């Protein structure tokens, strides 16, 4: 129903080498379609999805010169930030940038994003109103005053509400067979006795799309999350995703526990019980 | 598609 377009930017300064590392990736939902690496031989924007390949030379040469400017911007940003926090040039630092847009089940604009991070911590972020900036510290205020004077937020809105959305709609149409599909999870339960009095029940969810899924364990009809092990959703490597949840269960009381799977391509939420 | 404007920090 609802879809998204994302661009992730990573710039890491390398004191040991001559040039800082820059990596830029583009995502439509949970599928990667473009990449750019500063240490790559080609020095061009690279297709990663099958459906993005149908774009002409006009697109690729334009996206190449754009990401190169993005790379150049973040190289300067590394030097600007080290001066803000008064840090030495001997230490490595990471600048993370993310921007993109969300559409609803009607393919209309819902949310827009534009945010930065320095060494893991938040720096500057565009608010939900698309007119405001959130500065984390006093060094972020200097950036905030630069962008408010240049009216960058107003320039950004034209991209997020327009260009980001209309190109996302173009991608969804071109990759109809891949992006508009919905895969239902294959579910099964596995059992392992950890001790003479306890046992682990694992609730598997395999081969599903998109990655967004909910796995909850219940004891006697009540949500148990205090004694639940949940792993990060992992890609299979073909377009589908995988995830599981585990609980510590006293021996003989395995049937008192239930797993609940919620997915978009699933007509009804499934209840799973050990037998 | 990428954003055509490139603001610095």
């Amino acid at each position, epitope marked *: 129903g609802s879809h998204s377009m994302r661009y992730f930017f990573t710039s890491v300064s390398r004191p040991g080498r001559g040039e800082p590392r820059f990596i830029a990736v583009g995502y439509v939902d949970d599928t990667q379609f473009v990449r750019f690496d500063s240490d790559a031989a080609s020095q061009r924007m690279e297709p990663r999805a099958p459906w993005i390949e149908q774009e002409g030379p006009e697109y690729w040469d*334009g*996206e190449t*010169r*754009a990401v*190169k*400017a993005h790379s*150049q*911007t973040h190289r*300067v940003d590394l030097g600007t930030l080290r001066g803000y926090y008064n840090q030495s040039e001997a230490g490595s630092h990471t600048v993370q940038r993310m921007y993109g847009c969300d559409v609803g089940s009607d393919w209309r604009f819902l949310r827009g994003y534009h945010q930065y991070a320095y060494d893991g911590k938040d720096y500057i972020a565009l608010k939900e109103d698309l007119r405001s900036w959130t500065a984390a510290d006093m060094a972020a205020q200097t950036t905030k005053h630069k962008w408010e004077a*240049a*009216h960058v937020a*107003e*320039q950004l*809105r*034209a*991209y997020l*509400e*327009g*260009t980001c959305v209309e190109w996302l709609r173009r991608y969804l149409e071109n990759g109809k067979e891949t992006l508009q599909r919905t895969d239902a999870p294959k579910t099964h339960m596995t059992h392992h006795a950890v001790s003479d009095h306890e046992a682990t029940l694992r609730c598997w969810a395999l081969s599903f799309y998109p990655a967004e899924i909910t796995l909850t364990w219940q004891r006697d009809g009540e949500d148990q999350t205090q004694d639940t092990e949940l792993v990060e959703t992992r890609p299979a490597g073909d377009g589908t995703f995988q995830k599981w949840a585990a609980v510590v269960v006293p021996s003989g009381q395995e049937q008192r526990y239930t797993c609940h799977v919620q997915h978009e391509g699933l007509p009804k939420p499934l209840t799973l019980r050990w037998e | *598609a*990428l*954003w*055509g*404007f*490139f*603001p*610095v920090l």
Partner: T-cell receptor
Amino acid sequence: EAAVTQSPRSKVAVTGGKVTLSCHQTNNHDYMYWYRQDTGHGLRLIHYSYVADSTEKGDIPDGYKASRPSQENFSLILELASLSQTAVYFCASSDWVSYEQYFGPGTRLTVLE
Amino acid sequence: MDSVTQTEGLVTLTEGLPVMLNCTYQSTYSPFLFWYVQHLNEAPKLLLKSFTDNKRPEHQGFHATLHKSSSSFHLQKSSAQLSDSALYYCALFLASSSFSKLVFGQGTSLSVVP
């Protein structure tokens, strides 16, 4: 104050001769532009640069080639001069705020058979 | 698409009278417009911006209000003076290209007479 300079200020060339237009800028700007003006009307982009050693094509690149050896200098080169290249050439400069461009004094160029 | 249309040719005005120079534009998304002034034997320089607030921006004096509904950004002044004799460019800063750049119009020559 942001000041941009051009050389030469005036140039007379023959058809099929090499012409080089220089532009110096000492404002610490990454973005530099080459425009042309025809009979006191219209300002069209020929080539531009956002960083040193890299040049991008503008609106009308045909018959023109450009070079950015350093941040300060951005050259416009004409390998084969034609009659249609008779114009007044302006050199612009800006930072990331690319809508506020600072222009040079201009260069009158006339190509004759 | 992505175009600027100005008042064609020479505009002759007597000193004291209000200045009016037209600028219409074609654009794909929410854009921003700028006026560039060029005096005789001088470099073209930025005159005024479209910011600030709902349509209204402007410096020297000179002012312009942006109307997004009909895509208009006309240059205005209360009382013209002899020093206003110059060429005026209306520019559209590309709202969304692969690379954002200024698109200049054909330019309107103002000739204020005494």
